[PDB]
């Protein structure tokens with residue numbers, strides 16, 4: 006299967022490039038240095054970001070959008086909903102995924118997206134900030150903590166995680182297989198037929214292993230260090246879910262249909 | 268076949284296995300022999316109720332579990348106290364096992380303490396697995412056995428500390444690991460690096476890297492028929508964080524309902540800021 010593990014690597018990688026717009030390599034050239042991004046570092050660079058970046062897709066809903074930080078978080082959610090559809094599409098590219106019990110595919114997706122969103126979010130951030138709206142922007146890190154209430158402490162966890170994660174220096178070729186592994190997680194609650202999901206992940210894990218040893222001769226035991234990060238992820242996700250609690254001690258095209266889209 | 272390279276990782280394995288046997292009285296091997304029946308002299312006294320909870324104190328040695336403290340209006344707490352002194356003892360053994368891990372004592376004394384502070388519990392529940400089956404857990408060096416049901420019926424809060432452990436033990440035992448594997452695994456666990464506040468991550472990492480290499484070689488050599496057990500084992504480390512956190516997130520609650528119950532000092536310096 007030495008060749009059968011490359012076939013799978015190349016294939017996943019192709020679906021990855023086709024399902025995701027902004028890639029690792031991509032977002033990396035931007036973060037480090039033609040068309041520089043618009044940096045959001047304070048209140049005015051944001052108010053100015055609204056129109057300029059036109060990312061406003063998430064804003065136009067007049068009457069609700071009137072308090073900063075609610076509008077940023079609201080934007081964290083619109084792009085998230087977007088990404089879920091991209092993740093879902095990538096899933097179907099994973100050999101055997103489509104052939105599983107439909108309830109399980111939904112279940113795998115229901116619990117795998119949050120882990121996949123943070124993994125990729127790392128591709129878009131550095132110790133100093135995160136790339137937003139397709140790459141047209143860069144919302145600084147300090148500004149994010151500059152948000153108040155539980156808001157100014159929800160992005161700082163992910164920055165800490167991203168820093169450790171990106172240190173592994175993984176590329177799109179690598180992440181593609183990693184993303185799939187997370188999806189084919191046989192321990193998600195409510196699964197009806199775990200065997201098939203495990204066979205697939207294992208077949209995926211072999212390919213990831215071969216992928217990491219060929220692409221990073223230099224880094225000993227990278228396979229192991231990467232699998233360990235799945236721990237940081239679960240904490241990051243459980244933590245995140247807690248943040249969604251207090252944010253209820255906050256509020257709660259008219260909103261009555263927005264709430265239902267999320 | 269076998270080259271300079273591997274040969275070194277194999278000696279590390281034999282080295283840790285040997286320290287592990289030397290550090291923990293009740294190994295998985297002994298524990299399995301007790302639970303399965305290859306014995307007429309190792310059979311445990313079963314506790315599934317007060318009737319036998321009472322009987323137990325008689326046949327199987329205690330009052331080293333039940334420290335200076337007569338009884339207590341209810342059993343749920345007396346057990347708890349036991350699992351407390353036993354746990355602190357495990358920390359002790361785990362601590363002597365750590366020292367044997369090559370390079371571990373050569374690190375900054377503060378780092379050493381950090382690895383133990385977070386490693387101790389993940390290691391306790393890993394080993395605690397060895398003493399369990401879907402139906403219960405061995406106690407008192409193997410002399411007793413407390414049913415999974417007795418434990419889940421205990422008083423409202425206390426009858427809730429052990430189920431998650433059983434939940435993990437069953438999944439984890441399905442890996443069918445043995446003492447020689449666990450020794451290397453428990454070793455990787457201590458030598459994390461991503462532990463909070465570590466003053467010097469590099470050396471810690473260079474060590475784990477080697478242990479991971481030893482574990483990878485051990486697993487394939489020991490479970491050739493078990494594909495990706497290496498990765499499957501690493502993924503298990505997340506169930507541990509969750510067991511740990513859940514426990515701590517259960518400990519605090521008792522620190523209010525029971526203003527009269529006590530925590531071992533040590534045991535507090537572990538959970539502090541956990």
Ligand SMILES: CCCCCCCCc1ccc2n1[B-](F)(F)[N+]1=C(CCCCC(=O)O)C=CC1=C2
Pocket residue numbers: 025026027028060077080081082084085088122123125126129135136137138139144160
């Ligand atoms: C190929 C790209 C992979 C997709 C990455 C995952 C979704 C984006 C996301 C999640 C959290 C978060 N970000 B956030 F939502 F993007 N976000 C923002 C601002 C959002 C701007 C709109 C955008 O990026 O599309 C601020 C913190 C934060 C934090």
Ligand SMILES: CCCCCCCCc1ccc2n1[B-](F)(F)[N+]1=C(CCCCC(=O)O)C=CC1=C2
Pocket residue numbers: 328329330332333346349350351353354357358360361390391392394395398404405406407408413429
């Ligand atoms: C690295 C070493 C770790 C291996 C496992 C040793 C720790 C055992 C432990 C921890 C919690 C717990 N158990 B427990 F303590 F084993 N426990 C009991 C048994 C009480 C026995 C009382 C006696 O010793 O006489 C009941 C719940 C519980 C719950």
